[PDB]
Design a protein around this nucleic acid. Structure first.
Ligand SMILES: Nc1ncnc2c1ncn2[C@@H]1O[C@H](COP(=O)(O)O)[C@@H](O)[C@H]1O
Length: 152
DNA sequence: AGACTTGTACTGGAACTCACGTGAACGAATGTTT
C-alpha cells in the first residue's frame, strides 16, 4: 500500500492515493493507524538510537550501512549472526556516507595537525555529490544517499 | 547547516576503615644518699 501511494504521488494521481489511504483506514485499528501515520511522517520517537538497533541486528552493521547506504543489502547479507564479513570497503554503485569536517580553533591548529605541514583549501558552498562511473554508466548520489542521477 | 536535550561512560573526589608510627604517662625495680 505504501509503495502504491508513493508511486501514485510520483505519477500525479490523487484518487488512487485516496483509495489506498481509505483501504488502510478501513483495515486498521487506532494504534495501527497511529503507527502508520508516524511512519508516513518518517518519525517514530522510539527513544532507541539507530546505532543501537544496527548493533543488536548484527555485530558489524553500522560499517556496512555507512559503506553501502541501502537497508536491503544490510538486511540480506547480515542474516546469520555467527557469519560475519571479512572485509568491507567502498563498492561501485553503492552510496557511501561522506566524511565531514569539524570546527577548529585557529590558535591550536598546528597542534591538531601533529606539528606538520598541511593543506589549505577554499570552502565550496553548494550541494555535496559523489559520482560513480563505469564505462558510460553514470550514477550520482547526494549527501544522504538520495539518487539525483535523473537531474544530472 | 546551527543549537539544545538525553543519554553514556568514564574520571576523579569524599568518606569510611584499617594498619603503622609517634608522643606522653606510669608502676615496679634498682641504685644512690643520708
Ligand atoms: N572542499 C571541500 N571538501 C570537502 N567537503 C566540503 C568542501 N567544501 C565544503 N564541504 C562541505 O561543506 C560542509 C561545511 O559547510 P560550509 O561549506 O557551509 C562540510 O562538512 C562538507 O560537507
Amino acid at each position: 500500500l505504501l509503495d502504491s501511494i508513493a508511486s501514485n504521488n510520483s505519477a500525479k494521481r490523487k484518487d488512487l492515493i485516496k483509495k489506498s489511504l481509505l483501504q488502510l483506514i478501513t483495515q486498521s485499528s487506532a494504534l495501527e493507524q497511529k503507527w502508520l501515520i508516524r511512519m508516513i511522517i518518517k518519525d517514530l520517537k522510539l527513544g532507541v538510537s539507530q546505532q543501537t538497533i544496527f548493533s543488536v541486528f548484527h555485530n558489524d552493521a553500522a560499517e556496512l550501512h555507512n559503506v553501502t547506504t541501502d537497508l536491503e543489502k544490510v538486511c540480506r547479507q547480515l542474516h546469520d549472526p555467527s557469519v560475519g564479513l571479512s572485509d568491507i570497503s567502498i563498492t561501485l554503485f553503492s552510496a557511501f556516507k561522506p566524511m565531514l569536517a569539524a570546527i577548529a580553533d585557529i590558535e591550536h591548529i598546528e597542534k591538531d595537525m601533529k606539528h606538520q605541514s598541511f593543506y589549505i583549501e577554499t570552502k565550496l558552498d553548494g550541494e555535496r555529490m559523489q559520482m560513480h562511473k563505469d564505462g558510460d554508466v553514470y550514477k550520482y548520489f547526494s549527501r544522504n544517499g538520495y539518487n539525483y542521477t535523473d537531474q544530472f
